[PDB]
Every structure is written in structure tokens, then in C-alpha cells.
Symmetry: D2
Subunit: 243 residues, 4 copies
């Protein structure tokens, strides 16, 4: 049983890879660094139960994946943009950086999903879980471009799920914030930045960063299809910060 | 491990009991019919793994439950209002029916939660899952009173969770619609009422009623606390009808 | 033209009275202190163009108002709970206080509304504006009971509108926060509570309390019915605190 | 006093121009057809109070506008995509159409707003009103690409408002549906399609299309800043179809 995880080495990738693999999935992984055959050898060696794709184009990941199996049971569209770009203000930010925000967080996932419809349907169903952000639903002052791009994809989940659910393709969006991940809240920031500790104690009801195994637990639960009726919505993964 | 499920013979009750019980929990159940000793014995015989309470007051359920264990891991506040009162319109509806709508769907839950804080926190934490309704978030023309009351309890979850999450008491709200359940969408209805089939074919992307085992999956997932960071929010259980 | 403003001396009452009267309305006023004749007389003297009602029952205010006019063009359902009950927590709060929150903020406006349908319909329409609060939409940790109750009335507006709009009865909800008003954010608190001033600086984009005349204009705007298509929704009045 | 209205011959452009010029504004207009001198002249002659811009680039409209006045009081970023493109499905749509949907609906308005900040600020403030769509907040099965695009711009307003409001730059988003306009619900459509008549009967509480003057009403109201505390919110304009 195979799953596809994108941007495997960033954001929610590690948490996704680990959970699925522990659940018995063979995890086909995509990552920009995989354009380097050495990095693929490294990744698969350090990550038993995985296959590192060389494919870099969003519309071609599904076909590259299918070379390793009859069907794709689950896709985790693990889209991101590197810190500190997530905090790009409006004033002063280049047109090229704005275009890039939409390319990485909006267009890439649309092309990936568009390409995955025919195969996933022919297979009888699958689950497509988009990792977005709390801002794809609720606005933050320092995220004036990152929000709109993340928002575009949560809408994509909500609208497309209206037709794809009838084909057994279950779409979901997860909206993290205050999530211990290498991109936005690495362990070292928490360990070395009291300011982040004070913000969490102040704004996160749970009182702590969310763990990657919890992220993975949610990933695996949705991948199970056991609660199919919650299809088509955005799930806050923020420790009570949202709503 | 004990869980408490209220109005056990209605709404999400059967699904809740079956799943928790199936997952190893000893499920202490509440229900108005249990004031009768014979009904309590019959229920326990028909549902191995359960203890039926005689107690009927919302504020006394937690203490009655603790006579059966040291602590409560999960509470399913399965609140409902007998059909067809869910569809009571504003015009011509008596004051009494208006207050019963709030008593059964808003006041009762607050009174249960309220009485539950001290004991749950002293035990180190737990989950409290309110079974509400999709109208607790998105209005329906035929639910102008049933919505206001369901909306009150979803609000209760969102606010109370900002503070209780810190004591390890995790609050959630599940909002069903088109969920095969004895109170609002019994099997007899799906089997004999063309109209329901038409509505589902027209407005539920999933194209069918949600199954009890799917509501049981969701309840038991949340019960595990494996995905704690999604605490304090409302989950639609409508097969895509919502958002 | 005649308008009905409830709890005229509190919350958004003064804003509404001043603005509807500046607009030419003969504003019929309800208030708990009007059971006292001398208060009714001091209020009409201080507020020209106002008629003070002795009536205290939600279901009777409309017929009482009709004694001064052939029709009600606008109803401003200014519901509130006496300060500081708005901040009552979940734990340790008495059942009586919980009942009173729902009585003031949810039952009373429903009884009023219900009583207004037939006559506002026979008149061929009107506007009904419920002043609720930001927690009618988004949770605040310190409003776990006042929140749920406002959430009920906001849902009442959204549901009831689906049918009433057809009769020309246009419902709306305004949910203020940090709105300069005699009750929750009085000029007295702003001048003597540096913490409030700091919290507004930090959390409110407009950087200040909304003025009473700003409220009045939103209300005078809605009453004019010149933009009827925005019927049935909640309007945040927080200077950007929401969403 | 000047107002800038984009894509003035489409969507909400006509309503805006008529309303703002009637309200005393010199309305500077942008439109793809104004690349042609003849169209600008015919447009100027038939719309007293308007100035047609030859400028076609989003980030240059503000400077072009400023050749006609000292400041810009209001900007109406009326973005649209021609019908039937709004209805493009996810499957089979070209990458070019996908990209064009975002360019017209999200990237053009971002470039605009971005360019307006410095001057709008130095002038002490202004209002910026974005016409988006109901799918900017709620999904429709037939708008899986138009929706995302629109949602990014509602997200832009809500996030950007958090910082711009302090500068007196007030952002709003209006989301129509069932609004009589030349692009999505033209009068000839209404008069000639009994099917649209019946849907509206069925799904619009108000029972009819919103009128061009009601769009102008709302726009004129926002533009006066009389109710500045409602800044940074999305306003449904659907006759009650939403929420």
C-alpha cells in the first residue's frame, strides 16, 4: 500500500513519513533535493519503507509514483515556503516573491491534485490531505501574502471535495500553527528562544508546541478512511489557538 | 478505562457505545429510560461492557459515574431533542418548547461540563466530546430554534477549551447531518423515503448517510488523545454537505 | 416613522437612539428602569423624539409600541447582561446566573422576534437588528457563558432570515467588541484603566474604541434597507479585532 | 474627491460608478477597453463625472489616478474573470487558465493594493473595497478554481487590515452572488431564463437578484468611513443565500 508525501524533508514531511511508514505504508517521497541521486540514496537509507522520487514537476509526481505500485492510497500535499518568506509584508515585497508564494502554496498543489483525479478515481478512491496553515482560515498580521496563498488551497479543498467525494477521493486540509516542525517551529527555536515559549504559554491553550507524532496520528486517521463523513473540511492543528 | 455516554439510546449514543466498548472502554451510560431498573438490566444484557446509571440530573452524572471507577477518560455529551421538535418554527411555537430546546441542547451540556471540571482535572485530564449538529455552525431554514441552541453548545466548546485545554481536559464538538442514527435519519427512513434519497443525492458529496461506525471511529480517535492539537474545534460530520 | 430600541440606556441603546432620532425616527424605548414613571420622564426629557415604554415583557413590547404608530419600520434588539456577569466563568457559576445569561441574551430576543413577525409582515416588512457581540462568532476565554448565549442569537438571525427575508423582514446581527458604550467599555474604563488602553493598542487594528456615532451609522444604514442583499449575516464591529 | 474604480465596464463596475459619481465623487476608471482612445472618450461622454484611464498595469493605476487629484479617497478593486471561465472545472483545465484565474483575481489586486499603501497613508487614509464573490468564503461545486482565487483576496483583506487600519487605510471585501450585473447575472439572462428565475426562488431568501443600486449603497456607505469599526471583514451580498 503506497502513499505519496511531497516536500518530504520539510514542514510536515518527517511527521508524515514516520507515521505512515509505521502504519505499514510504502511511502513514495518527493523533495526538491531528490533531483540529486546521492540525496535519494541518503534518504531511503535513513528512512526505511520509502522510495525517493527524482521527479520535480507537480503534475508528474503521480505517474512517477505509480511506477512503484498499482495505486496510490494516500497523498499528503505537504506544501511550504521557507522561513522567513512566510512573513513577507506587502510593502517592499517584490512581484517575483509574490508570484513565488502562490506558486509553492497554491499552484503546485492544484497541479498535483488535478493530475491525481483520473488515477485515484479509476482506483476506486483515495485520500488527499493538504498541509496548509492556520492562516488558510484565520488571518495573522505578519502573514499578508502567506495567508492569501494558504487560503486559496483550503478553498480548493472545500470546493473540489464537493464533486470528488462522490468518486471516493476524500480531500482534507490541515491547518497548523505552533507545530514543532523543522520549517516553522524547530526544536532549537523552542529550546533557544524564550520569546517563543512566552508566546505559547500566552496564546496556545494546550500550552505547548504540537508534536510531530500527533501530526502523524491525524494523518494516519484520515488516511484510514474510517471517518469518511468528515470529508472536505479544514482541521485546525494549533493547540486551541484557533478558532 | 471508563467513558460516560449520555442519552445512550438516542442520536449518536448507539454508535458511541459500540465503538468505545469495542475499543476496550467500560462505558457507563446515561438515558431517561434508565430510571427503570428493568430497562437498565436489559440494556446491560444487550450491551456487554456497559454499566447503566439510574441518575437523571446532568450535574450528578459524573459523581454517579465515579462510583464505578477511579476516573473518567472520556465523556460523550450526546445531547438531543426528539423529532420533530428539531424542526419547530418560530411562529406559533410556545414558550415552553423554546425553553425545552435550550434546556436539552444547551443548559444540560453546560451543567454536565461544569460538574466535570474538578474531577477531570484532578485526574490529570480527559476528553469531552459534544455531539451537536451541523446547524451549530451553518443555518438551515427549517431549524430556527434547534440551530440557536446547538450554536450555544458549539460556542461553549470553543470558549471553554481556551482555558480547560491547559488542564489536559480536551473539548471537541461534532456536528452531524445526514448521519444514519435512530433519532434524525433512521434506516427505515433511508429505506422507504424517496425524498431523503433525493436530498442526499443532491446535497451530500459523499452520496450516502454517514455510518454509525464512522461516527464511532471519530469518537474513539478523539478519545485516544493521539491528536491533541486539534482540541477546541467543531468537526462537520456531513459527508461534505458542510462547509 | 417608528423604531423600537430595547434596553435603551445600556450597551448600544444610546448609540441607536441618538442616531435613529437624528435620522427622523420617533424612537420608542424599552428599558428595565422605565417601570418607574419619573425615569420615563427624565429619559424623554433628556432624549427628544423618544417615547418611553413601561412594558417589560419581551412578547409585549411590539403591541405597546403599536399604540403610538401604525407600524414599526425598525427594531433594534439591544440585548445585554448586567456587567460584570459577561465575564462569569464556567466553573463555580450558579445555575441561576447561567439561566439568566440565556434569559437576557437569547430567550428575550426570541420572544420579541417571534412576537414581531405577524405585524411586521402585515406591514409589508421592516428591519430587525440584534446587537449581540464578537463572541457571537469568535470565542474569548473570559466569556464562556456570555459567548454561547450570544452565539444562539447570532444563529437565530442566520436561520430565521432564510424565511423572513421573503416577507421583507430583514434580520441582522452586529457583534461589537471594544465598542465605547456605557456598559462594557465606558469612557470611565478607558480613562482609568491603562491596561485596557494597552490591550486596545496591541489588539485592535483601528487602535481605538469604536465610537457611538459609528454604531449609530451602521444601524441607521441597516434601517434604511438601501442594501437589503446583505440581509441575514453577522457584522463584526471591532475595529479589525475579528476575524 | 476622487474614487478609483477598476474594470469599470464589468461586474460591479457599473454599480460603483453610478453610486460614487452620484455621491459627488470624480470617479477615475480603469478598464481593458480604455487602451483604445475612442472607447475612453465614448465612455467619458456617457458617464459624466468619470475620467477614463489608458493605463492597463495594476501597479500603475494609482499614479495614473493621481495625475487627476491630490489624493484617492476610495479604491474599488472590482476584479473579475469573464463568464464562463468562472465555472472552469478542476479536471482538464489548462495550466494557462489556472494561472489566469489567479492573475485576474488575486495577483492583480495584490499589486494594486501594494502600490496604494504609501500614498494612501501619506494622505491620512482612504478606503479600499474589494469586490470578490460568495465563494470567497463558502465553496460552490462549480467554482473549484474561481473559488480559490477569490478566497486568496478575501484572505488578503482580512490579514492586511490588521496593519493598514492603524494608518487609516480601511479594507473591506464584498462577496456577491445572485447580484444583477453584466458579467454574472445580466438582466437579459434574468428576463429570458425561467431556470434562473426558479433557482433564485428556491435559494435566495430575498427572492430576487440584488440590485445595482444596493451594491452602490453598500459601496457608498463603506467609502464614507462613517462606520470605520467594521473594517477588515467580508460582507456577503447574496440576498441571504449565505451564510
Amino acid at each position: 500500500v503506497i502513499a505519496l508525501v511531497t516536500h518530504a524533508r520539510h514542514f510536515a514531511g518527517p511527521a508524515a513519513v514516520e507515521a505512515l511508514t509505521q502504519d505499514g505504508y510504502t511511502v513514495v517521497c518527493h523533495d526538491a533535493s531528490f533531483a540529486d541521486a546521492a540525496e535519494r540514496q541518503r534518504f531511503e537509507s535513513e528512512n526505511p519503507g520509502t522510495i525517493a522520487l527524482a521527479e520535480q514537476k507537480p503534475e508528474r509526481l503521480v505517474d512517477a509514483t505509480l511506477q512503484h505500485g498499482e495505486a496510490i492510497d494516500t497523498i499528503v500535499s505537504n506544501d511550504y515556503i521557507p522561513r522567513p518568506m512566510n512573513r513577507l509584508p506587502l510593502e517592499g515585497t517584490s512581484e517575483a516573491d509574490i508570484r513565488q508564494m502562490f506558486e509553492a502554496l497554491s499552484i503546485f498543489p492544484i497541479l498535483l491534485l488535478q493530475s491525481a483525479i483520473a488515477p485515484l478515481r479509476a482506483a476506486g478512491g483515495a485520500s488527499v490531505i493538504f498541509i496548509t496553515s492556520s492562516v488558510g482560515k484565520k488571518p495573522l498580521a505578519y502573514n499578508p501574502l502567506y495567508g492569501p496563498a494558504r487560503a486559496a488551497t483550503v478553498a480548493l479543498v472545500e470546493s473540489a471535495a464537493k464533486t470528488l467525494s462522490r468518486d471516493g477521493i476524500l480531500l482534507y486540509a490541515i491547518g497548523p500553527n505552533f507545530f514543532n516542525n523543522p520549517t516553522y517551529f524547530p526544536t532549537s527555536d523552542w529550546e533557544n528562544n524564550p520569546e517563543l515559549r512566552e508566546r505559547v504559554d500566552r496564546d496556545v491553550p494546550l500550552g505547548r508546541l504540537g508534536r510531530p507524532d500527533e501530526m502523524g496520528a491525524l494523518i494516519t486517521f484520515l488516511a484510514s478512511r474510517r471517518a469518511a463523513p468528515i470529508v472536505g473540511q479544514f482541521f485546525a492543528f494549533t493547540g486551541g489557538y484557533l478558532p
